[PDB]
A paper describes a structure:
Glutaminase is a mitochondrial enzyme that catalyzes the first step in glutamine-dependent anaplerosis by converting glutamine to glutamate, more simply referred to as glutaminolysis. GLS1 has two full-length splice variants, kidney-type glutaminase (KGA) and glutaminase-C (GAC), whereas GLS2 encodes liver-type glutaminase (LGA). Others and we have reported that BPTES inhibits KGA by binding to an allosteric site between a pair of homodimers, and this results in a dramatic conformational change in key loop residues (Glu312-Pro329) that render the tetramer inactive. Additionally, we determined the crystal structures of the cKGA (catalytic domain Ile221-Leu533 of KGA) in complex with the trans-CBTBP enantiomer (1S, 3S-CBTBP), and CB-839.
CB-839, unlike BPTES and trans-CBTBP, is asymmetric across its center and has multiple unique moieties, including the replacement of the terminal phenylacetyl groups with a pyridylacetyl group and a trifluoromethoxylphenyl acetyl group, as well as the substitution of a pyridazine ring for one of the two thiadiazole rings. The complex structure for cKGA:CB-839 was determined at 2.1 Å. Two molecules of CB-839 are found to be interacting with the cKGA tetramer. Similar to BPTES and 1S, 3S-CBTBP, several hydrogen-bonding interactions mediate the binding of CB-839 with cKGA. Notable unique interactions include the hydrogen bonds between the pyridazinyl and acetyl groups of the inhibitor with the side-chains of Try394, Lys320 and Asn324 from cKGA. Furthermore, the thiadiazol group of CB-839 is also involved in a water-mediated interaction with Asp327 of cKGA. The terminal moieties of the inhibitor–fluorine and oxygen atoms of the trifluromethoxy phenyl group, as well as the nitrogen atoms from the pyridine ring of the inhibitor are not engaged in any hydrogen bonding contact with cKGA. Hydrophobic interactions between the aliphatic linker of CB-839 and the side-chains of Phe322 and Tyr394 from cKGA also contribute to the binding. In comparison, the driving force for CB-839 binding is the higher number of hydrogen bonds and this is assisted by the hydrophobic interactions from the pyridinyl ring. The terminal electron-withdrawing trifluoromethoxy group of CB-839, substituted on the phenyl ring on BPTES, deactivates the aromatic ring system and increases the electronegativity of the pyridazinyl nitrogen atoms, thus strengthening the hydrogen bonding interactions.
Numbering used by the authors: 218 to 315, 319 to 531
Write the structure that this text describes.
Amino acid sequence: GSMIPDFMSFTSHIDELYESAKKQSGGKVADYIPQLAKFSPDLWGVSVCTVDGQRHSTGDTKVPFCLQSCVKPLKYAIAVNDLGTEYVHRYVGKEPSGNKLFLNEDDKPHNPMVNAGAIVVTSLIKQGVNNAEKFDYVMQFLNKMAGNEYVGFSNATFQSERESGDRNFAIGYYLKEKKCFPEGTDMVGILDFYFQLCSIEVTCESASVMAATLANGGFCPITGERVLSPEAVRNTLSLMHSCGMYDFSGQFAFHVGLPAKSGVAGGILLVVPNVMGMMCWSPPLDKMGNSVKGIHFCHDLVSLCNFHNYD
Ligand SMILES: O=C(Cc1cccc(OC(F)(F)F)c1)Nc1ccc(CCCCc2nnc(NC(=O)Cc3ccccn3)s2)nn1
């Protein structure tokens, strides 16, 4: 599957799109915790990792930042990989909401990409062991996805996220009341694990390798290791396609047509199946919560290389 005939000319076009996006100065850096409000609005990085293992970065691609919602497709993939589609979707829905409600009509969170869904997915991983082992288990998994490149942890983000996460505690108690967790779940402990996962740190470079693992049918392109089952990958990409960009998800599926997942740190994890993974990062967000520069870049990328799913 050679739709990138000349990698060096392709990176030349990446750089031009990078420079064009750089001029987009709009948006607001998230500031509900100090660990996000700190970030400069001018940070802007794009990293590419093909399914071959070819790499290209431009801009601020080695500055660590928190995954935040970008971790949601990754922990869903781990859950499906270990437990199968059917078991996971006993607890969480499979489609966009069209949203302030915690649960759909079946008393399940709408999908794994919204907070209530990610909290339920978190309760499914490595059940029975304590939180330190749960975290270590997911960390080892993310190391394999990233081919052992930068995966860190921001204790300061974790502490601030947990102390100000009233909406997530409201979701936690509502899900407990509607019996959404597996039997024996310690809800407060699940919220802790959830806040920790949101505080895992990557760079553009390490994250693009994670995305490239999803683009490569579950095989890490820079180690050849099998990390995720084909089922886990397929499921994760479908939900990223339809639910990955908050309230912009429907527009993004229509105009861009690639599986992607945004996050409040300004990251956009982007997958071009069978071609490449990308991570774009610029902290200033539009009013729907997506990185202004990243969105502009994603539109330009598809209008240039015919990467749209139905192109
Ligand atoms: O009940 C379900 C299935 C369901 C599916 C579809 C329709 C439906 O009927 C309903 F919309 F009327 F509820 C119910 N899910 C569910 C129900 C309750 C909850 C916990 C509560 C969610 C958090 C909120 N609390 N108050 C709110 N008020 C507003 O947002 C203000 C507003 C503005 C505009 C129009 C209406 N209100 S949000 N979480 N999830």
